[PDB]
RNA sequence: AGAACCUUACCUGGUCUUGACAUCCACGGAAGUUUUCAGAGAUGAGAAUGUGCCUUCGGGAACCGUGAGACAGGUGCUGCAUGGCUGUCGUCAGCUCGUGUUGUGAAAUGUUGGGUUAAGUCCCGCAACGAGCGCAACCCUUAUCCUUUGUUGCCAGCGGUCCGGCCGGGAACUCAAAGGAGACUGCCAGUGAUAAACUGGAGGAAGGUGGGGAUGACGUCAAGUCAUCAUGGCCCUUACGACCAGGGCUACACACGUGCUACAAUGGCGCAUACAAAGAGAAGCGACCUCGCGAGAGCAAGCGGACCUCAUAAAGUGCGUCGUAGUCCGGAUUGGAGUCUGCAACUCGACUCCAUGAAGUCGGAAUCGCUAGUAAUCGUGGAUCAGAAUGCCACGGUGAAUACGU
């Protein structure tokens, strides 16, 4: 099989937001390169925070907050240079961070 | 259990005071507040006046106390004896 | 509130760089097991008084937004009450009510 | 209180025999949630019983759970200046569970070198009706025969059934004074 | 319809993967013997109860791989894992196994630890006066 | 005084957040404190305009402000200079250079905060306040929406007690997790200390302005999605 | 939510007043770095690197030293002076708006009855009529179950072959996150005033809106915060500010609250033996590495966590052993060595381990949560986090009595 030159993986906190941004990268990768794969879902991380609910005292009642972080990988089996160019020319997001380092 | 781990200590703070004091044999109580710091060969026959949080206590250094800290001789806490509690109001 | 906890946060970063950078592995090199029949000299470990305020042991930070003491959280730069306050108005990214 | 009557979860015949009487037992044998230990103990007890008599492994187990059985419990329901007591009949599910609990209360202090031997041996005792919960069954019936005098808020309750267009006999049903 | 039929036997957060085929009655559990993994245990009579019941202990050969759960529980998951795979021996087969209770997944599902409470529901214990 | 704040519980579903960035945990606090600083210092610079909300976003090497206004021109100013002075000083404040767009303008006569600013203003000027709270509700339901709750605080008329009043009309749901419902808690001053107005106003039970995606993975994106099925 | 200093309210000792943090001016130094020495260190002098920035080329900002004010600062007081926000009862099962009629009106009535529910849920209905809030809903999460993706996920079968996805190769397969599917008192039967609804019947993981959570009307309670933070009234600002060191909450006399772990044998002991989930890891952890008595250690490629690590998951499983004697349970104390984070580990820090070894035999008054993945009990991970977890927070193992009656 073909060799993966570079790894583009998408991290976002909103569970709906990550699937939509990923699907447009996948499409961008098929329309401007030749060797793409369906995005592997990969397990989702969750952090747990607990705080008071009143300003002072009232110990019993509390508040609980969650934050999820969703990771998508795509997994381009060979990325074309024209895919890396288009990623870098068309960048403007805050809702997803794309990591272009590999592992 | 606790130790002093692996490094070598002489204290930077005790070094300048000791260096001038040892040359005289002995001189006036060295005003130390650095009671976390251990006792060493260099300090023998001097008198280190040891801040305890409220005031200095003069500690005489001599060969049997080099195994110890300044804070070990110098108190902190008060122990309240237990014959009877104070009961009453005062007029 | 207090100005002293804000004054501290500002003072540590020039002094982290100034004392600590030269001293990084120096506790391990001159004192610990890496000093096996090498160094172990007092005259090169009396130098750890200078990094005393610049220590990993004083990066307790407390809030950046208010300077408010006690109950801190590094992941916001905040505390219990002040997290909840920003979260009520939706100021923290990714933060939602938990249900499971 | 409570608008209607609600039911209860059901425990399911044990994987090694196919018995409900075992499945209710393993549950009151449970210590610190550890039902798979109380399983090894129940079944190792049954093989020790089978060595006293090989005619059934469940023989002395099942009859112990007939012989040490409580039918009755004592309730309290005030009459004026005094509380008194009224026996009430216990439901089969708790009749069985009281009786099994008491065999196992005794078996865990018996000092034999395994709960499997202790338990099998306290079923040998309670099987013949000579053991430790024979007195405990008798004491509980003594209270029900002795206290047959008193009833639940007795002076007002006797008027209340006949006055609520209820019957001339004590109504066991919601919104009659009981 | 399959070459060797398969069950997923998911019970109480444990998944028993269980591949059944025709043979001579043999067992492999987590790439070892029955004797190795469930040595002198009631767990051995568990995995055996549905294969005795539809009368094919001495006629199904088996390959079992199992993850998650507690050891006494994994045997319990295998009891569904075997029964999942059988559905077509007869048309009534899953129906009768569910009626004997050995398809039936333990329908009770976790409650999360709740905030301000010391467990899932236990509100804190205070006498405070 | 019961209840979690109403907008605090919606932020994971069908309401988007007040800020949108990603900073990979360790830099998350320095970015929230900068996002807070740009919020605190910027709303003072556009004091002369009218504004309902502020939404701040941090892409790589850039900070992008979205701002919500009573009308399209107010922040824009003369020949674009006014908004270019906003973007200059957000760049000074921020740990990156800055960008700014104005959003579409929506329900400025009904917004939570532009109504609560109006009611505090009466209190600031020490009017008898005899009809004020009712006339607030009347005009707010006359101009639109489906229900309003107003709650007024600040020691009314200058009393040496707490003294509240409130008025709800039509439909105001409270525990709702779906659709926006616009709430604002104003804080504002008069002669004797802080006064404040709380405005819950209600447009609808269904807003689609954030929803989950239409499709499963396979029909969305690429036509040829399929794998080899081995051949390592 | 992590008290040797710092932190951290306090106290003591040191030190200066526009200020240990910003803006502004007058005068000297670039700030930054490297470095000797005095002083506890704060702090200062001096050496050595650098001359950036802007400039009638004076001088200054940045930042520091020095000095004033405007001002920064203040855990500075008042919670019948407040703003913001939330707790209690309580998921109480109620609360109210518009409007008519009856009363002279305060106020009733409706919000109460019959029938039914988790519910002021809903059928009938009286001068009460119409409607809204809570409750109801959208909502996530999980379960089976269909489905696609196919690695940092997988391997019924087949090949090379020790039968290891390492590779020819496979999608059957969990498996991850997402489209979602199923369950509606809807069908059918009985009951129930036609009725909501409870129960049965059938398939299925499951029938009572599937399990779980989100989720609390309005408000007295003068609840509670001026110490997140807003803020008037209102005080010092050479201070009711702040740096540096040492001490302190966790003191000790006991009582009182809570949780852990125990008092047993359901167990401990020895030797052998098993399968996790979920997440965290740029002050951090970390392969390989060599050192070490297990643990650990220092070094370092490295990491972004379905890759590598924390992590050796524990209770439980196998055999023999033990009987209420503080033991065969419980292991605190304490002596000593090997290891750690730091000027520093004595009182107030961590980890391993050797020897001996007390309290406690399930606690009178007292005292609470709980309806089923619940209570019980065991371990694990995490927020905080130099180094401290019995706490808190989430996760997974094993997992109960009964709910008649008011």
From Swiss-Prot, chain B:
<keyword id="KW-0687">Ribonucleoprotein</keyword>
<dbReference type="GO" id="GO:0022627">
    <property type="term" value="C:cytosolic small ribosomal subunit"/>
</dbReference>
<dbReference type="GO" id="GO:0003735">
    <property type="term" value="F:structural constituent of ribosome"/>
</dbReference>
<dbReference type="Pfam" id="PF00203">
    <property type="entry name" value="Ribosomal_S19"/>
</dbReference>
<dbReference type="InterPro" id="IPR020934">
    <property type="entry name" value="Ribosomal_uS19_CS"/>
</dbReference>
<dbReference type="GO" id="GO:0005829">
    <property type="term" value="C:cytosol"/>
</dbReference>
<dbReference type="InterPro" id="IPR023575">
    <property type="entry name" value="Ribosomal_uS19_SF"/>
</dbReference>
<dbReference type="GO" id="GO:0002181">
    <property type="term" value="P:cytoplasmic translation"/>
</dbReference>
<comment type="subunit">
    <text>Part of the 30S ribosomal subunit. Binds S13 and L5 and cross-links to the A site tRNA.</text>
</comment>
<dbReference type="GO" id="GO:0019843">
    <property type="term" value="F:rRNA binding"/>
</dbReference>
<protein>
    <recommendedName>
        <fullName>Small ribosomal subunit protein uS19</fullName>
    </recommendedName>
</protein>
<dbReference type="InterPro" id="IPR002222">
    <property type="entry name" value="Ribosomal_uS19"/>
</dbReference>
UniProtKB/Swiss-Prot annotation, chain C:
<dbReference type="GO" id="GO:0015935">
    <property type="term" value="C:small ribosomal subunit"/>
</dbReference>
<dbReference type="GO" id="GO:0003735">
    <property type="term" value="F:structural constituent of ribosome"/>
</dbReference>
<dbReference type="GO" id="GO:0019843">
    <property type="term" value="F:rRNA binding"/>
</dbReference>
<dbReference type="GO" id="GO:0005737">
    <property type="term" value="C:cytoplasm"/>
</dbReference>
<dbReference type="GO" id="GO:0000049">
    <property type="term" value="F:tRNA binding"/>
</dbReference>
<keyword id="KW-0687">Ribonucleoprotein</keyword>
<keyword id="KW-0689">Ribosomal protein</keyword>
<dbReference type="InterPro" id="IPR023036">
    <property type="entry name" value="Ribosomal_uS14_bac/plastid"/>
</dbReference>
<dbReference type="GO" id="GO:0002181">
    <property type="term" value="P:cytoplasmic translation"/>
</dbReference>
<comment type="subunit">
    <text>Part of the 30S ribosomal subunit. Contacts proteins S3 and S10.</text>
</comment>
<dbReference type="Pfam" id="PF00253">
    <property type="entry name" value="Ribosomal_S14"/>
</dbReference>
<comment type="similarity">
    <text>Belongs to the universal ribosomal protein uS14 family.</text>
</comment>
UniProtKB/Swiss-Prot annotation, chain E:
<dbReference type="InterPro" id="IPR020574">
    <property type="entry name" value="Ribosomal_uS9_CS"/>
</dbReference>
<dbReference type="GO" id="GO:0022627">
    <property type="term" value="C:cytosolic small ribosomal subunit"/>
</dbReference>
<keyword id="KW-0820">tRNA-binding</keyword>
<keyword id="KW-0689">Ribosomal protein</keyword>
<keyword id="KW-0687">Ribonucleoprotein</keyword>
<protein>
    <recommendedName>
        <fullName>Small ribosomal subunit protein uS9</fullName>
    </recommendedName>
</protein>
<dbReference type="InterPro" id="IPR023035">
    <property type="entry name" value="Ribosomal_uS9_bac/plastid"/>
</dbReference>
<comment type="similarity">
    <text>Belongs to the universal ribosomal protein uS9 family.</text>
</comment>
<dbReference type="GO" id="GO:0002181">
    <property type="term" value="P:cytoplasmic translation"/>
</dbReference>
<comment type="subunit">
    <text>Part of the 30S ribosomal subunit. Contacts 16S rRNA. Cross-links to the P site tRNA and weakly to the A site tRNA.</text>
</comment>
<dbReference type="GO" id="GO:0005829">
    <property type="term" value="C:cytosol"/>
</dbReference>
<comment type="function">
    <text>The C-terminal tail plays a role in the affinity of the 30S P site for different tRNAs. Mutations that decrease this affinity are suppressed in the 70S ribosome.</text>
</comment>
From Swiss-Prot, chain F:
<dbReference type="Pfam" id="PF07650">
    <property type="entry name" value="KH_2"/>
</dbReference>
<dbReference type="GO" id="GO:0005737">
    <property type="term" value="C:cytoplasm"/>
</dbReference>
<dbReference type="InterPro" id="IPR018280">
    <property type="entry name" value="Ribosomal_uS3_CS"/>
</dbReference>
<dbReference type="GO" id="GO:0002181">
    <property type="term" value="P:cytoplasmic translation"/>
</dbReference>
<comment type="function">
    <text>Plays a role in mRNA unwinding by the ribosome, possibly by forming part of a processivity clamp.</text>
</comment>
<dbReference type="InterPro" id="IPR015946">
    <property type="entry name" value="KH_dom-like_a/b"/>
</dbReference>
<dbReference type="InterPro" id="IPR004044">
    <property type="entry name" value="KH_dom_type_2"/>
</dbReference>
<keyword id="KW-0694">RNA-binding</keyword>
<protein>
    <recommendedName>
        <fullName>Small ribosomal subunit protein uS3</fullName>
    </recommendedName>
</protein>
<dbReference type="InterPro" id="IPR009019">
    <property type="entry name" value="KH_sf_prok-type"/>
</dbReference>
<dbReference type="InterPro" id="IPR005704">
    <property type="entry name" value="Ribosomal_uS3_bac-typ"/>
</dbReference>
<dbReference type="GO" id="GO:0022627">
    <property type="term" value="C:cytosolic small ribosomal subunit"/>
</dbReference>
């Amino acid at each position: 099989m073909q060799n993966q030159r570079i790894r583009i993986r998408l991290k976002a906190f909103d569970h709906r937001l990550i699937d939509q941004a990923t699907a447009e990268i996948v499409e961008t990768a098929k329309r401007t390169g030749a060797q793409v794969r369906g995005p592997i879902p990969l397990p989702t991380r969750k952090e747990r925070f607990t705080v008071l609910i009143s300003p002072h005292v009232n110990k019993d009642a509390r508040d609980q907050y969650e934050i999820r972080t969703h990771l998508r990988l795509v997994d381009i089996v060979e990325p074309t240079e024209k895919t890396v160019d288009a990623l870098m020319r068309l960048d403007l997001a805050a809702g997803v961070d794309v990591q272009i380092s590999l592992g | 259990p606790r130790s002093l781990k692996k490094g070598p200590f002489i204290d930077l703070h005790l070094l300048k005071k000791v260096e001038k004091a040892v040359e005289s044999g002995d001189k006036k109580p060295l005003r130390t507040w650095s009671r976390r710091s251990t006792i060493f060969p260099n300090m023998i026959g001097l008198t280190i006046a040891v801040h305890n949080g409220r005031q200095h206590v003069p500690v005489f250094v001599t060969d049997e106390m080099v195994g110890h800290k300044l804070g070990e001789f110098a108190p902190t806490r008060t122990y309240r004896g237990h014959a009877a509690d104070k009961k009453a109001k005062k007029k | 509130a207090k100005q002293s906890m804000k004054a501290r946060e500002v003072k540590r970063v020039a002094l982290a760089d100034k004392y600590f950078a030269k001293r990084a592995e120096l506790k391990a090199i001159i004192s610990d097991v890496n000093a096996s029949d090498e160094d172990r000299w007092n005259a090169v470990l009396k130098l750890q008084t200078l990094p005393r305020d610049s220590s990993p042991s004083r990066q307790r930070n407390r809030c950046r937004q208010t300077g408010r003491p006690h109950g801190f959280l590094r992941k916001f730069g905040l505390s219990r009450i002040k997290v909840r306050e920003a979260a009520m108005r939706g100021e923290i990214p990714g933060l939602k009510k938990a249900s499971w | 209180p409570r608008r209607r009557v609600i039911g209860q979860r059901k425990i399911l015949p044990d994987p090694k025999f196919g018995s409900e009487l075992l499945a209710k037992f393993v549950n009151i044998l449970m210590v610190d949630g550890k039902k798979s230990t109380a399983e090894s103990i129940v079944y190792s007890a049954l093989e020790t019983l089978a060595q006293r008599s090989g005619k059934s492994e469940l023989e002395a187990f099942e009859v112990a759970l007939e012989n040490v059985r409580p039918t009755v419990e004592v309730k309290s329901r005030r009459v004026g200046g005094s509380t008194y007591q009224v026996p009430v009949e216990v439901r089969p599910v708790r009749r069985n569970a009281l009786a099994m609990r008491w065999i196992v209360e005794a078996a865990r202090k018996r000092g034999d070198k395994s709960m499997a031997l202790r338990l099998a041996n306290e079923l040998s005792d309670a099987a013949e009706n000579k053991g430790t919960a024979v007195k405990k069954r008798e004491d509980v019936h003594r209270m029900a025969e002795a206290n047959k005098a008193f009833a639940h808020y007795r002076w007002l309750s006797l008027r209340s059934f006949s006055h609520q267009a209820g019957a001339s006999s004590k109504q066991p049903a919601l919104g009659y004074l009981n | 319809a399959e070459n060797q039929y398969y069950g997923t036997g998911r019970r109480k957060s444990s998944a028993a993967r269980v591949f059944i085929k025709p043979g001579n009655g043999k067992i492999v559990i987590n790439q070892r013997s029955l004797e190795q993994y469930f040595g002198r245990e009631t767990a051995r009579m568990v995995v055996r109860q549905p294969l005795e019941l539809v009368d094919m202990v001495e006629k199904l050969d088996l390959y079992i791989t199992v993850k998650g759960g507690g050891i006494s529980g994994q045997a319990g998951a295998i009891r569904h894992g075997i029964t999942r795979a059988l559905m077509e021996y007869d048309e009534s087969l899953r129906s009768e196994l569910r009626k004997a209770g050995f398809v039936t997944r333990d329908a009770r599902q976790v409650e999360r630890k709740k905030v301000g409470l010391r467990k899932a529901r236990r509100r804190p214990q205070f006498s405070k006066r | 005084g019961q209840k979690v704040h109403p907008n605090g519980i919606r932020l994971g579903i069908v309401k988007p957040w007040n800020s949108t960035w990603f900073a990979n945990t360790k830099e998350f606090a320095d970015n929230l404190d900068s996002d807070f600083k740009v919020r605190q210092y910027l709303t003072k610079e556009l004091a002369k305009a009218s504004v309902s909300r502020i939404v701040i976003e941090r892409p790589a090497k850039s900070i992008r402000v979205t701002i919500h206004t009573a009308r399209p021109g107010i922040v824009i100013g003369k020949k674009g200079e006014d908004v270019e002075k906003l973007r200059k000083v957000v760049a000074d404040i921020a740990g990156v250079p800055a960008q700014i767009n104005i959003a579409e303008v929506r329900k400025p006569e009904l917004d939570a905060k532009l109504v609560a600013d109006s009611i505090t203003s009466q209190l600031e000027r020490r009017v008898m306040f005899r009809r004020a709270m009712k006339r607030a509700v009347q005009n707010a339901m006359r101009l639109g929406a489906k229900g309003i709750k107003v709650e007024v605080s600040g020691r009314l008329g200058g009393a040496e007690i707490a003294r509240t009043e409130w008025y709800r009309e039509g439909r105001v749901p409270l525990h709702t997790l779906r659709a926006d419902i616009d709430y604002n808690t104003s804080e504002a001053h008069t002669t004797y200390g802080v006064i404040g107005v709380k405005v819950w106003i209600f447009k609808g039970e269904i807003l689609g302005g954030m929803a989950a995606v239409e499709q499963p993975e396979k029909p969305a994106a690429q036509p040829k999605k399929q794998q080899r099925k081995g051949r390592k």
